Amino acid sequence: EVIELPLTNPELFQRVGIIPPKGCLLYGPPGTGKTLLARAVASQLDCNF
Amino acid sequence: IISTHLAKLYDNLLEQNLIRVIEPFSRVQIEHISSLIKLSKADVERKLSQMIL
Amino acid sequence: GSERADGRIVKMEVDYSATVLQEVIETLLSLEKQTRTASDMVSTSRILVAVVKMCYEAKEWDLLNENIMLLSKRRQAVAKMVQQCCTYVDLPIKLRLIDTLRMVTEIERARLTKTLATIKEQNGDVKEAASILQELQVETYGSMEKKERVEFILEQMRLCLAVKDYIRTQIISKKINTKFFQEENTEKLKLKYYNLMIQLDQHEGSYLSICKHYRAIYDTPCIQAESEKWQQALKSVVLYVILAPFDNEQSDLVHRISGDKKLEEIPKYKDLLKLFTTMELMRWSTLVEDYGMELRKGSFGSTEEGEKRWKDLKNRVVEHNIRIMAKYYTRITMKRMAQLLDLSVDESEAFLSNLVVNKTIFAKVDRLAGIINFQRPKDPNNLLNDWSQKLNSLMSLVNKTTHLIAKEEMIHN
Numbered sequence: 001e002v003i004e005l006p007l008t009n010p011e012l013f014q015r016v017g018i019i020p021p022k023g024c025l026l027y028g029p030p031g032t033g034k035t036l037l038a039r040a041v042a043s044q045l046d047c048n049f
Numbered sequence: 050i051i052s053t054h055l056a057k058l059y060d061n062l063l064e065q066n067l068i069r070v071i072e073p074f075s076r077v078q079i080e081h082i083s084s085l086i087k088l089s090k091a092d093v094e095r096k097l098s099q100m101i102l
Numbered sequence: 103g104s105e106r107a108d109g110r111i112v113k114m115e116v117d118y119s120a121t122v123l124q125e126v127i128e129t130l131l132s133l134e135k136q137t138r139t140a141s142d143m144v145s146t147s148r149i150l151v152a153v154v155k156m157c158y159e160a161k162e163w164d165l166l167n168e169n170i171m172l173l174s175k176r177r178q179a180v181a182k183m184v185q186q187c188c189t190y191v192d193l194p195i196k197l198r199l200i201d202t203l204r205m206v207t208e209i210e211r212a213r214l215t216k217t218l219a220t221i222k223e224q225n226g227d228v229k230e231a232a233s234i235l236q237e238l239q240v241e242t243y244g245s246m247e248k249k250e251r252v253e254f255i256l257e258q259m260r261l262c263l264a265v266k267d268y269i270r271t272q273i274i275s276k277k278i279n280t281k282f283f284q285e286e287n288t289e290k291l292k293l294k295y296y297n298l299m300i301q302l303d304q305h306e307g308s309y310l311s312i313c314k315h316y317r318a319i320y321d322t323p324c325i326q327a328e329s330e331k332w333q334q335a336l337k338s339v340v341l342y343v344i345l346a347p348f349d350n351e352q353s354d355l356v357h358r359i360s361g362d363k364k365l366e367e368i369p370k371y372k373d374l375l376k377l378f379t380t381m382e383l384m385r386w387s388t389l390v391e392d393y394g395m396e397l398r399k400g401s402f403g404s405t406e407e408g409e410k411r412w413k414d415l416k417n418r419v420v421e422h423n424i425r426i427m428a429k430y431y432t433r434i435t436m437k438r439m440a441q442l443l444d445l446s447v448d449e450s451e452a453f454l455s456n457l458v459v460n461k462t463i464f465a466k467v468d469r470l471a472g473i474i475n476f477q478r479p480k481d482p483n484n485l486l487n488d489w490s491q492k493l494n495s496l497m498s499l500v501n502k503t504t505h506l507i508a509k510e511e512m513i514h515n
């Protein structure tokens with residue numbers, strides 16, 4: 001929601017009065033599924049990661 | 050406080066009206082400025098003196 | 103989702119039995135909540151249709167409408183889309199619709215705001231109804247489709263003028279996009295839009311603007327075609343280009359109109375525009391006599407808003423004559439000037455003063471029963487410019503004039 005949507009469905013974001021998200025930081029115990037998330041995101045989204 | 054101030058506003062108003070009565074004109078016979086501004090000549094030329102001066 | 107359909111059909115009877123239902127609603131509501139998924143939107147279809155249907159039979163709805171809002175408060179977006187679009191279609195209507203908008207606070211709410219606002223009052227109560235439609239359109243821009251969208255923007259317009267307002271007429275007006283007038287569909291509509299913009303601008307006592315609008319509508323293929331359409335608009339275009347005060351855009355607009363071939367078909371109005379194009383003294387009376395009747399006949403009206411134009415026209419006339427005298431006469435007197443402008447010593451001095459105040463000529467009077475002076479105040483430098491400019495122009499006469507002399511010698515002998 002923060003990342004994908006604010007692009008293909010931000011055209012209406014302004015209708016709430018809120019800039020798209022800025023940044024997102026994973027942070028967790030070594031092995032919580034962080035590095036595997038960046039892979040999953042760039043694999044599905046696909047744009048310019 | 051705002052009342053006594055009207056005197057200022059009134060003054061600025063009179064000065065303008067005059068400047069507009071003589072704006073386009075020459076040798077405008079002063080009785081005309083009077084009846085237009087609707088005031089006695091004596092204090093008109095009383096002021097026009099002040100303005101010229 | 104079979105039993106979702108099947109047991110529905112089963113309960114359809116079961117309800118329709120007790121519908122022939124207030125108590126029979128519950129055991130269905132629960133079975134639709136125990137699911138929550140694909141079949142849940144089919145359960146939403148069928149259950150939300152029967153619940154609405156129960157309402158229609160007897161109606162018996164005082165609780166339904168509100169019952170549904172409570173039930174609708176319990177929620178399944180697309181299940182609710184129809185559930186609200188089905189309950190959309192007088193005292194009973196008020197509170198029910200209040201519940202529909204109440205719950206929908208997305209394309210359904212607006213279309214119940216049309217109905218609610220206009221239908222609820224449709225009269226003096228406009229102030230109360232139209233209160234709602236002073237908004238709701240604002241951020242629904244991309245959600246609505248421009249037909250409906252713009253459509254009740256126009257409603258906002260006419261309700262705002264009948265409200266007797268202007269501001270929100272102004273802002274609510276300019277929010278319209280002409281670009282949407284590439285589409286012939288919306289092009290049919292916009293006639294409304296401009297017509298209002300006229301009404302407004304008439305209220306504002308603008309004219310030139312009015313003429314630009316009437317111009318624009320007059321550019322419509324639909325009314326280009328029909329000869330009985332474009333006449334009464336074309337006329338008005340004239341009359342307003344006449345009433346507008348002399349200025350930049352007035353000229354080229356008037357000049358362009360005079361060129362329009364269609365304007366030939368009109369006759370007296372033709373003489374009017376041609377009468378303000380050319381530079382000559384107007385003499386008011388003859389004008390009034392010749393054109394008074396033909397004017398008044400057109401649907402210049404009463405002695406109120408319309409009649410008020412009669413005074414303008416006189417002004418424009420004065421500005422016209424005083425506007426040309428400035429061209430020819432280098433100096434002028436008083437009496438004769440009054441005679442030329444018909445008006446006495448007063449109607450003149452006043453007209454001249456207003457022109458110089460707002461500034462529309464350079465004239466300086468010599469009062470003592472004497473002379474108006476229209477010549478600008480140049481200085482040695484100004485006079486010299488004319489001489490310097492004259493010298494230059496002569497050169498080209500002396501240079502241009504050379505090639506002809508030679509052209510003949512070569513072509514002659």
Ligand SMILES: Nc1ncnc2c1ncn2[C@@H]1O[C@H](COP(=O)(O)OP(=O)(O)O)[C@@H](O)[C@H]1O
Pocket residue numbers: 029030031032033034035036037
């Ligand atoms: N939620 C998960 N689902 C499946 N595999 C996981 C998950 N979390 C960790 N793994 C395993 O660990 C790897 C991901 O490690 P990672 O999240 O990159 O650790 P770190 O956050 O230290 O980089 C994956 O390759 C997978 O084999």
